[PDB]
Tab-separated table of C-alpha atoms in Angstrom:
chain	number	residue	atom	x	y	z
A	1	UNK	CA	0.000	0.000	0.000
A	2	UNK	CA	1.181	3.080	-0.707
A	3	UNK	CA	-0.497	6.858	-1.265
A	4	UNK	CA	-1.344	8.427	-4.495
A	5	UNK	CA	-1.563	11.998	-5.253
A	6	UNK	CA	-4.216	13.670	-7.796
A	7	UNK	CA	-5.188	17.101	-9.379
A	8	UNK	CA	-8.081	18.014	-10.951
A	9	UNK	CA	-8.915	21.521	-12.644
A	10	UNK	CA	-11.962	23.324	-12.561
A	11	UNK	CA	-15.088	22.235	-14.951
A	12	UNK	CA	-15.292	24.902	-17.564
A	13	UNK	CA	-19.238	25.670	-16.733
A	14	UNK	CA	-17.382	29.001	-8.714
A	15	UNK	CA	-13.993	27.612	-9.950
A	16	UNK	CA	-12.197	25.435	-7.999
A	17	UNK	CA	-8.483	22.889	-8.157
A	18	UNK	CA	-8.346	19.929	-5.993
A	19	UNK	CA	-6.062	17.700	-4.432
A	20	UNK	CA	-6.695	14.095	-3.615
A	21	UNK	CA	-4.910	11.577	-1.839
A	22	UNK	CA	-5.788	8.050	-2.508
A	23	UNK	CA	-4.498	5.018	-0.404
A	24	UNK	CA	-3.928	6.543	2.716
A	25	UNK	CA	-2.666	3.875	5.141
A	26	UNK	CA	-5.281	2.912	8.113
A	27	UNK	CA	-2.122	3.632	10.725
A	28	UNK	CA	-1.610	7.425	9.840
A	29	UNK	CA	-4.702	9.013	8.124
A	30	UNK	CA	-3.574	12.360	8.696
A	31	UNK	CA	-2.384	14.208	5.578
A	32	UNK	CA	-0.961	17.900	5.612
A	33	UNK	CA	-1.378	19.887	2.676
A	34	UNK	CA	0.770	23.191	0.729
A	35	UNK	CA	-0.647	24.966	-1.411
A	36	UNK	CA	1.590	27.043	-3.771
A	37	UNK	CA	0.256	29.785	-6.687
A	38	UNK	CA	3.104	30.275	-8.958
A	39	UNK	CA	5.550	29.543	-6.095
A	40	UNK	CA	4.055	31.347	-2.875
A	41	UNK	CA	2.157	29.690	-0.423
A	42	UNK	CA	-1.690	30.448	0.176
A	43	UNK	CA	-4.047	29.249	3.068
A	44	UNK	CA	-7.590	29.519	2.646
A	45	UNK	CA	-7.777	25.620	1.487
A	46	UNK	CA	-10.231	23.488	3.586
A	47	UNK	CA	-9.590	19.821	3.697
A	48	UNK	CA	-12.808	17.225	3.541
A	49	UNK	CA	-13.194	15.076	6.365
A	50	UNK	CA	-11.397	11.274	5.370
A	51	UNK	CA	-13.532	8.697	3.359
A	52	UNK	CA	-12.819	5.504	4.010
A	53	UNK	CA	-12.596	3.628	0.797
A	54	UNK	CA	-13.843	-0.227	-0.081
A	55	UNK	CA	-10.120	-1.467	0.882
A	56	UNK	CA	-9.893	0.335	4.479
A	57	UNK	CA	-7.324	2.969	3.079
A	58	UNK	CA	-8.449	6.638	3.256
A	59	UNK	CA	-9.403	9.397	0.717
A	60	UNK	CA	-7.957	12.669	1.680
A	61	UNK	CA	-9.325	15.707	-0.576
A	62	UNK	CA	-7.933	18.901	-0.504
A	63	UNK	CA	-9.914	21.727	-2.310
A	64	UNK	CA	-8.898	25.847	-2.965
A	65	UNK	CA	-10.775	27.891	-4.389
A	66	UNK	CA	-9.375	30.099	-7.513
A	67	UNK	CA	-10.110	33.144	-8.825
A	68	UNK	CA	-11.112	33.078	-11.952
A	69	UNK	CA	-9.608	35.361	-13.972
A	70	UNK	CA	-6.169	33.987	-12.344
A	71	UNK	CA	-6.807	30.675	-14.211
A	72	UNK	CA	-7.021	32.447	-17.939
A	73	UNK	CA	-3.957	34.217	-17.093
A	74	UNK	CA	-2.356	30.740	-16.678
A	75	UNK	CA	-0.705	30.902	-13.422
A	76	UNK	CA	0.809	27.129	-11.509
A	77	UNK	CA	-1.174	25.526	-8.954
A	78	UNK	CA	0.847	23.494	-6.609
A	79	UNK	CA	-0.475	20.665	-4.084
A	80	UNK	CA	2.255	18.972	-1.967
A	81	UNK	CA	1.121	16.478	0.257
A	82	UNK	CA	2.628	15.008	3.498
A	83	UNK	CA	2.409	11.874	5.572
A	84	UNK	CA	4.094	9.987	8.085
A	85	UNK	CA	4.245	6.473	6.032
A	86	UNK	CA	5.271	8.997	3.149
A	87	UNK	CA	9.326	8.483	2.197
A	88	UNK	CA	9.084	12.009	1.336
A	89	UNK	CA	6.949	15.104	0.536
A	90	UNK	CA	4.758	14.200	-3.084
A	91	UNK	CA	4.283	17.440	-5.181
A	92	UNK	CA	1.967	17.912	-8.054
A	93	UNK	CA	1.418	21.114	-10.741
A	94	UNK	CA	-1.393	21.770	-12.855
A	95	UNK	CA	-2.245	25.245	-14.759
A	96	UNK	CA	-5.135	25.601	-17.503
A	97	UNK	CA	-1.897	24.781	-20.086
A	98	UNK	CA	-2.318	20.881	-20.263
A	99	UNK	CA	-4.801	20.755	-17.481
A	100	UNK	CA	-7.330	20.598	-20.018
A	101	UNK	CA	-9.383	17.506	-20.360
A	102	UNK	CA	-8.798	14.696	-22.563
A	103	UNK	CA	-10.713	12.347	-24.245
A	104	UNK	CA	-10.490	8.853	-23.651
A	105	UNK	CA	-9.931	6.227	-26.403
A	106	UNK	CA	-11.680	2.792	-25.545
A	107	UNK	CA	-10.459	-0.346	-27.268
A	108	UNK	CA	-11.381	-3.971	-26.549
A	109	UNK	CA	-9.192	-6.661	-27.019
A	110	UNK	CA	-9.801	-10.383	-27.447
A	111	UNK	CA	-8.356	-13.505	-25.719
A	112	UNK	CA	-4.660	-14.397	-26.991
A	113	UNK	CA	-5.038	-17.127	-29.205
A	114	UNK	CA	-2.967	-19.269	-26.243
A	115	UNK	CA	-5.219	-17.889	-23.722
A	116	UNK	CA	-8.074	-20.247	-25.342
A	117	UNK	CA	-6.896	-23.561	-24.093
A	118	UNK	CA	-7.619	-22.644	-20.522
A	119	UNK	CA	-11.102	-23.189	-19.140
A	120	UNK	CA	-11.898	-19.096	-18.710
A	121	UNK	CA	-10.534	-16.253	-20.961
A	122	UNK	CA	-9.573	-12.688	-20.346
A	123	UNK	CA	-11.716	-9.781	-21.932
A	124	UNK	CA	-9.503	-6.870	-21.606
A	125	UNK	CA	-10.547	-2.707	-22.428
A	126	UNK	CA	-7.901	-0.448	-22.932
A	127	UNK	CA	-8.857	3.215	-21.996
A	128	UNK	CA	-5.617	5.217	-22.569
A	129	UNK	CA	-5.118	9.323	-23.140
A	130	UNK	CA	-7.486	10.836	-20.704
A	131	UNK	CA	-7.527	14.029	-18.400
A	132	UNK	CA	-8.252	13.794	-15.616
A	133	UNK	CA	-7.671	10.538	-14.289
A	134	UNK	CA	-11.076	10.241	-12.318
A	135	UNK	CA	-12.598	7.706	-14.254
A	136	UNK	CA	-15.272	4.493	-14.165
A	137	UNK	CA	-15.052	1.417	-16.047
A	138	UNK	CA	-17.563	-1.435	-16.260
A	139	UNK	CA	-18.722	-4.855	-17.703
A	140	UNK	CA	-22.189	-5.857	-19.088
A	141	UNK	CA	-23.582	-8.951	-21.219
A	142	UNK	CA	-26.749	-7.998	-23.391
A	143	UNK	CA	-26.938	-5.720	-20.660
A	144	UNK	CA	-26.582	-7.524	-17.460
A	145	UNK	CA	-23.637	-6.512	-15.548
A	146	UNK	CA	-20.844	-8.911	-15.286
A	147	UNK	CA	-19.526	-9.490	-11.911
A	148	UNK	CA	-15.840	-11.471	-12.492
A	149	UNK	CA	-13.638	-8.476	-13.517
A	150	UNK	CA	-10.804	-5.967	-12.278
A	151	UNK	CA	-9.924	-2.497	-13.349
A	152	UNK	CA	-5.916	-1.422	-12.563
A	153	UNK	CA	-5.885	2.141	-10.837
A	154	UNK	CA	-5.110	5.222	-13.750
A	155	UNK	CA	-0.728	5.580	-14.879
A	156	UNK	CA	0.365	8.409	-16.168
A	157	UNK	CA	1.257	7.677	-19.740
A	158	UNK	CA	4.553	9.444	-20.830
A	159	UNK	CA	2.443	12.921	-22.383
A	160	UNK	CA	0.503	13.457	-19.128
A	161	UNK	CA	-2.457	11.197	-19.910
A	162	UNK	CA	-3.629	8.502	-18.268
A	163	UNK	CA	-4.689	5.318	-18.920
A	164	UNK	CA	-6.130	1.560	-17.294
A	165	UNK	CA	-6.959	-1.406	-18.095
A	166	UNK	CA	-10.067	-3.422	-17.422
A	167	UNK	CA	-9.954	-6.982	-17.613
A	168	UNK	CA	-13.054	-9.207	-17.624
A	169	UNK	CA	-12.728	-13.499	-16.977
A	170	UNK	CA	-15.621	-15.456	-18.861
A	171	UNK	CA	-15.873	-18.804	-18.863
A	172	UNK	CA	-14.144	-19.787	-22.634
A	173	UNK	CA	-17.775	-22.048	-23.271
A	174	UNK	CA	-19.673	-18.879	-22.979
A	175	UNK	CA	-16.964	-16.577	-25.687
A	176	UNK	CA	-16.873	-18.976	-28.003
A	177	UNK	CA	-20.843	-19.263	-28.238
A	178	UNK	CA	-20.752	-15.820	-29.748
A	179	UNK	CA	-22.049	-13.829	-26.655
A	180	UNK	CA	-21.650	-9.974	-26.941
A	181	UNK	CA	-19.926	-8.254	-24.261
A	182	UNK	CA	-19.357	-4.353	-23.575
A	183	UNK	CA	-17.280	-2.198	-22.067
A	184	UNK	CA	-18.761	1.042	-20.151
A	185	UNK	CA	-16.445	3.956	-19.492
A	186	UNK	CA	-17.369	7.439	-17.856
A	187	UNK	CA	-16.046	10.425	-17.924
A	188	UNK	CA	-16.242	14.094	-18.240
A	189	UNK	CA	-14.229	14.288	-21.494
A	190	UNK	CA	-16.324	11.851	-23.375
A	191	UNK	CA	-19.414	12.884	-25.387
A	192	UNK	CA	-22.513	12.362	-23.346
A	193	UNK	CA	-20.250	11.822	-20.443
A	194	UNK	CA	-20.610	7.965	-21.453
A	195	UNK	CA	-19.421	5.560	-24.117
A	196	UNK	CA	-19.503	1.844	-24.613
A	197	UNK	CA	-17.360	-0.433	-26.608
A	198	UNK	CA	-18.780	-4.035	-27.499
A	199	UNK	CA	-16.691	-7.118	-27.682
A	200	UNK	CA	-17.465	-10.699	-29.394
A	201	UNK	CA	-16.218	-13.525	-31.473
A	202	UNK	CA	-15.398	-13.179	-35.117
B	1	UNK	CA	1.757	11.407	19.527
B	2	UNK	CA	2.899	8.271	19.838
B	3	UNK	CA	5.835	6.916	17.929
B	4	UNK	CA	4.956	3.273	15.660
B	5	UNK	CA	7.029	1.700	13.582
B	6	UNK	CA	6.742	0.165	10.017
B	7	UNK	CA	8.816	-2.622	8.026
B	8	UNK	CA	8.772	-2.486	4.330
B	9	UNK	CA	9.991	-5.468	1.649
B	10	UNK	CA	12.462	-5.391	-0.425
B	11	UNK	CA	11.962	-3.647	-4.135
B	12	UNK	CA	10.902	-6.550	-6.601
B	13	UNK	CA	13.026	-5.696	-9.406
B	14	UNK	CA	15.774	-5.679	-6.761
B	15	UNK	CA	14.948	-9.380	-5.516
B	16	UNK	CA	15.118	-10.521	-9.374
B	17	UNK	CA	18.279	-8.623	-10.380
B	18	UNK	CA	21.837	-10.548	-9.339
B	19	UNK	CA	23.309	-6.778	-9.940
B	20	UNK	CA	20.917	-5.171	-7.292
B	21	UNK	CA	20.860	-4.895	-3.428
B	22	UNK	CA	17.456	-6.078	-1.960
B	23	UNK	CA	17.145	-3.921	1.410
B	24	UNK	CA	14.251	-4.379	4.430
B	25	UNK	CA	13.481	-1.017	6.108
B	26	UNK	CA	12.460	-0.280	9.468
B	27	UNK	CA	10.973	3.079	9.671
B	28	UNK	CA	10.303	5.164	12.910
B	29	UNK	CA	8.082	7.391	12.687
B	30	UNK	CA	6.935	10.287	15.469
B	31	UNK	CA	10.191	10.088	16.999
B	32	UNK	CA	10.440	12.414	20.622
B	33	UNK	CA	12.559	15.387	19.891
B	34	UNK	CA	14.074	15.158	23.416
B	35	UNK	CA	14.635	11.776	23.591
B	36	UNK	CA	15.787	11.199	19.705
B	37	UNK	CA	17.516	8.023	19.870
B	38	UNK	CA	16.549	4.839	18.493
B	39	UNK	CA	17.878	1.442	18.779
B	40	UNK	CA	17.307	-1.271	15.912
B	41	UNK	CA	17.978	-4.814	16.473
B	42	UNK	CA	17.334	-7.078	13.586
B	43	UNK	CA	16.943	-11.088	13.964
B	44	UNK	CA	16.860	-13.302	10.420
B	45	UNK	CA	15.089	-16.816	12.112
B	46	UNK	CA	15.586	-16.035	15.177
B	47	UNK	CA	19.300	-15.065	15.230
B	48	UNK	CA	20.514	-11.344	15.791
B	49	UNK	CA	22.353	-9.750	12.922
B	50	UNK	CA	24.620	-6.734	12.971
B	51	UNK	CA	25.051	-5.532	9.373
B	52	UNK	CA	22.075	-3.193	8.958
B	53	UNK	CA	22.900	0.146	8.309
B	54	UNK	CA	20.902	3.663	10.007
B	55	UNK	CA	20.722	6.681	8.268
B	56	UNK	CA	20.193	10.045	9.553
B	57	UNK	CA	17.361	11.365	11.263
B	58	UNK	CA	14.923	13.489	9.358
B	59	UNK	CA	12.917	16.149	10.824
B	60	UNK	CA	8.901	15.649	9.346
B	61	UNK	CA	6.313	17.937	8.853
B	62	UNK	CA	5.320	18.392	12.846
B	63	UNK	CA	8.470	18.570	14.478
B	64	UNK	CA	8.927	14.983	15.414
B	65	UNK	CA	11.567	12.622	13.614
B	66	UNK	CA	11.693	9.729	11.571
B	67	UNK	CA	14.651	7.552	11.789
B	68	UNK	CA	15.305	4.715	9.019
B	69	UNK	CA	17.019	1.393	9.350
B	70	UNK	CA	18.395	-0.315	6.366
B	71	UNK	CA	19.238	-4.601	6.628
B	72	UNK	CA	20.196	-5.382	3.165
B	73	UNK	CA	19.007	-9.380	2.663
B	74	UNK	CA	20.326	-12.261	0.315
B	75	UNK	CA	18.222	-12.866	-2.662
B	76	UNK	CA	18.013	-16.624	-1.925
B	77	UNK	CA	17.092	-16.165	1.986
B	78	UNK	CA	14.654	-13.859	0.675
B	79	UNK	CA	13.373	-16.070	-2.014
B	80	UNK	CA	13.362	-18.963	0.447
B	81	UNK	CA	10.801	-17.233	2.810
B	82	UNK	CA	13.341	-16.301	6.074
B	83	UNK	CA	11.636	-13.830	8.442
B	84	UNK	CA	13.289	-10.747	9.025
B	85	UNK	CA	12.363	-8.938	12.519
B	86	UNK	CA	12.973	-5.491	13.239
B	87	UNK	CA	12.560	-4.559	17.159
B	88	UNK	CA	12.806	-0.905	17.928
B	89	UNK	CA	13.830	0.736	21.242
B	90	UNK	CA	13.540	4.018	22.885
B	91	UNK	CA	13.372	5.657	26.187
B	92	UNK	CA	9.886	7.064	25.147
B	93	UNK	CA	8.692	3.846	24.564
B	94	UNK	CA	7.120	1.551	27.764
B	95	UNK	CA	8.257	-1.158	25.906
B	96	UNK	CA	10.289	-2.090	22.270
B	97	UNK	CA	7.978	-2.848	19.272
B	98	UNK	CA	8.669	-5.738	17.361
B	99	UNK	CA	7.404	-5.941	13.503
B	100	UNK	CA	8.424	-9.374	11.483
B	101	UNK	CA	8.125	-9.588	7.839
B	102	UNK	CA	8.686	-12.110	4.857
B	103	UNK	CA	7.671	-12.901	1.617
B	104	UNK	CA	4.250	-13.424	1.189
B	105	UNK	CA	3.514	-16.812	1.624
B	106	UNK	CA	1.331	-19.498	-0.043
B	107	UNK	CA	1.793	-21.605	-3.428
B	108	UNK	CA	4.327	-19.570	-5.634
B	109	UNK	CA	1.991	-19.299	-9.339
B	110	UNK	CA	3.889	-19.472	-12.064
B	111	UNK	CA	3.026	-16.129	-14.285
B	112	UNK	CA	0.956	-16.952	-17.681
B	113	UNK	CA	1.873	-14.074	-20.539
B	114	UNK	CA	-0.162	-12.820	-23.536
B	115	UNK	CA	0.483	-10.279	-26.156
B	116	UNK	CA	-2.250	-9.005	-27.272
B	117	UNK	CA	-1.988	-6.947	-30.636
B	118	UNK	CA	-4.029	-3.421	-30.906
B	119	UNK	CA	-7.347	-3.298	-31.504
B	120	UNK	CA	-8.244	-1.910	-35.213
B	121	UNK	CA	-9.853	0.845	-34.100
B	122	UNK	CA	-6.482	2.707	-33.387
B	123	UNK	CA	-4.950	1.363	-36.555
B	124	UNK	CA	-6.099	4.414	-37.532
B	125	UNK	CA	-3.973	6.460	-35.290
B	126	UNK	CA	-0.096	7.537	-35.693
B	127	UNK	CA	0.897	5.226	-32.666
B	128	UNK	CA	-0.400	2.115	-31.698
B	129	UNK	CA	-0.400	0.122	-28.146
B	130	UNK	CA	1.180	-3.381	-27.731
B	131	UNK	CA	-0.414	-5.198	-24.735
B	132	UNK	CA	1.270	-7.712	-22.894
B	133	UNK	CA	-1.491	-9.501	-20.082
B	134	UNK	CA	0.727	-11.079	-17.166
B	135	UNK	CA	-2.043	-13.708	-15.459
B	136	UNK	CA	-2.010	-15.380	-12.440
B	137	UNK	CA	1.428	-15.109	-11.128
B	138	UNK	CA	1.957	-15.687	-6.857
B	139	UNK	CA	3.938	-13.356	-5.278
B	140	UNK	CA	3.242	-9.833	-6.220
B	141	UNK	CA	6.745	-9.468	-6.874
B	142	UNK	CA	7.243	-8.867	-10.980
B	143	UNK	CA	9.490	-7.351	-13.054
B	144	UNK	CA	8.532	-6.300	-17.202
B	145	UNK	CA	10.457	-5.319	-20.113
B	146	UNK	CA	9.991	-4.682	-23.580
B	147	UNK	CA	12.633	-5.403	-26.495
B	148	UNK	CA	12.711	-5.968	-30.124
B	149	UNK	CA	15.325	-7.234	-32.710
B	150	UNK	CA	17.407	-7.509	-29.808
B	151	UNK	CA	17.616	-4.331	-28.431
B	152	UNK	CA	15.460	-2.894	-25.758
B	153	UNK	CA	11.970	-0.961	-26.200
B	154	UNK	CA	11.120	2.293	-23.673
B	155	UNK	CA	8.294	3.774	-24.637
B	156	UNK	CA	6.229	1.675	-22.366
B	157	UNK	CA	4.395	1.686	-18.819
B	158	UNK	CA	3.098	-1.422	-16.982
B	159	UNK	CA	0.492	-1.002	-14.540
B	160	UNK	CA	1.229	-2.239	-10.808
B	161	UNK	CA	-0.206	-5.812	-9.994
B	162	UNK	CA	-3.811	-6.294	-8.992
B	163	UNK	CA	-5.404	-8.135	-6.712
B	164	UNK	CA	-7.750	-10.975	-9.093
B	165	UNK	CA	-10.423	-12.693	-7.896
B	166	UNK	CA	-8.647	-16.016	-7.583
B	167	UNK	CA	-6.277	-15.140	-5.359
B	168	UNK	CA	-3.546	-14.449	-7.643
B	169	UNK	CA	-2.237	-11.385	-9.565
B	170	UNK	CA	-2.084	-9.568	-12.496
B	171	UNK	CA	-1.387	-6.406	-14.487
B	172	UNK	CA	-0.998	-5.046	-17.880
B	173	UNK	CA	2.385	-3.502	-19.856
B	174	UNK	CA	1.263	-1.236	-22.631
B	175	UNK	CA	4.194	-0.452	-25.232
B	176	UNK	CA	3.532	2.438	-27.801
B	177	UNK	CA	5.243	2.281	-31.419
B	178	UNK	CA	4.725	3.441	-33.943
B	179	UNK	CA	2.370	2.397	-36.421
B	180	UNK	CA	4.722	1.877	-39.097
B	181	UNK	CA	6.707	-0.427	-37.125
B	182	UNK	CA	3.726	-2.561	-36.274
B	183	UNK	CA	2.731	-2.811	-39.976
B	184	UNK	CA	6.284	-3.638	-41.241
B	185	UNK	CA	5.761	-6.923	-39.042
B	186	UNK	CA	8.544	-6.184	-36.833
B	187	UNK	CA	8.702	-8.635	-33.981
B	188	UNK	CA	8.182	-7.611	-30.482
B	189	UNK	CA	8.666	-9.411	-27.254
B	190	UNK	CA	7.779	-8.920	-23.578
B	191	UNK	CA	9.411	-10.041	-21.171
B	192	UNK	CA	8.968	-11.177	-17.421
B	193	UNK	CA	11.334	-11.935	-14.459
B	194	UNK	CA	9.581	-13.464	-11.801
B	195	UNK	CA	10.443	-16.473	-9.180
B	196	UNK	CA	8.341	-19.058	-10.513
B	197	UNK	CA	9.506	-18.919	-14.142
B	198	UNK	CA	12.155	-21.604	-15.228
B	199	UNK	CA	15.081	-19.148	-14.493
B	200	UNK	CA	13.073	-16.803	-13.127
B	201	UNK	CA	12.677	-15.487	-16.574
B	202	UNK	CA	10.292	-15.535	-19.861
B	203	UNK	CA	9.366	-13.561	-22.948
B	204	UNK	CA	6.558	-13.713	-25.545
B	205	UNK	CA	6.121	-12.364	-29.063
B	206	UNK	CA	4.366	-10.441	-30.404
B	207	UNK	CA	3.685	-9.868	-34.237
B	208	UNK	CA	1.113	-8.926	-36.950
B	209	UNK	CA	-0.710	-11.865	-37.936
């Protein structure tokens, strides 16, 4: 276990960047926050009270406010983070240049053809290049959600993207039957706010 | 308030690399300022050993200090499951603390590998992503590369391992080329260091049909 650090710009429709902290260990939840604009320190940032997520580690938010006109002028927002468990201090930047949000690209991908001997099979969903990483992923059969899959957390891809895979275990009986199985993403850069990519047998 | 102590593992890539220095670390933390000493004792089995190494105290975010021992450990005893015990002393503490730690035990799963080429939706695009799916591997401890004619690939990034439902792991390794590349039929191979692999190593192709 170890903490993760997350910024998220304002939605273009009162403005405001936040800071989360994912994976907070059960021992230490506190988490300190700095807040730097352009290099100097503000202080009017209120932190939520912890969330406990599904795996007993804590969700520590951060939120400041920003004036508006300061974000069209482009200025750096600055969170750095602090926690006991921490080996050191985690910093992260983000400014209206390359804070914007990015669409993500959904792509389903088949069994390997060595994968098919074995009594279940791997569905996998590639969602890569998307800002911010707060993000939801899903699994349905002619609509009925599928139960028997796992979504990695977000990585940074190397040009400041994200992306995650989703992988989804059928049995191989039921894939090679020709069911039809989709993929549901959401997420604010996507049209509608929600897209689906379908996956079957040749 | 009151000072705990945690022990990490070892790195994986540094308990699958004969050129790398697997380390346990026994961190400190809340440390009294005015009683700032801290004394480690580490036992492998049972027995006391004396080759750790403390580094300097560091000074955290609310005045209280966090002091770091370093045992570096064989990569066979660690392979081999020996326990290594950090116990940690102070005068602020009633009593030391005592925190054991191994390699996760259970039935060692050897790792099953699949390239996966990209889908044909982003054969459209300029770059295109090379999947390799690393199944059902026990530990967590995993190490990925990409390479091709030979010489290694580095435009890639592998996800950390999850948690499946069977008990086992897995993650993905996504490597970006270039579409070109891909269409030329230029080979490409991932591969995977990991304990339960004949020589704790393996690699799979991957190629246009």
């Amino acid at each position: 276990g170890g903490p993760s650090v997350f910024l998220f710009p304002p939605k273009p429709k009162t403005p405001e960047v936040t800071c989360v902290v994912v994976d907070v260990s059960h021992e230490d939840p506190e988490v300190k926050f700095n807040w730097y604009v352009d290099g100097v320190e503000v202080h009017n940032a209120k932190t939520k009270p912890r969330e406990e997520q599904y795996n007993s580690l804590y969700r520590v938010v951060s939120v400041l406010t920003v004036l508006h006109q300061d974000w069209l002028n482009g200025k750096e927002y600055e969170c750095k983070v602090s926690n006991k468990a921490l080996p050191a201090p985690i910093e992260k930047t983000i400014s209206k240049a390359k804070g914007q949000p990015r669409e993500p690209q959904v792509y389903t991908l088949p069994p390997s053809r060595d994968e098919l001997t074995k009594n279940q099979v791997s569905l996998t969903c590639l969602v890569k290049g998307f800002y911010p990483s707060d993000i939801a992923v899903e699994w349905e059969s002619n609509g009925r959600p599928e139960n028997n899959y796992k979504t990695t957390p977000p990585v940074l891809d190397s040009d400041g993207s994200f992306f995650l895979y989703s992988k989804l275990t059928v049995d191989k009986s039921r894939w090679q039957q020709g069911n039809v199985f989709s993929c549901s993403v959401m997420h604010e850069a996507l049209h509608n706010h929600y897209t689906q990519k379908s996956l079957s047998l040749s």
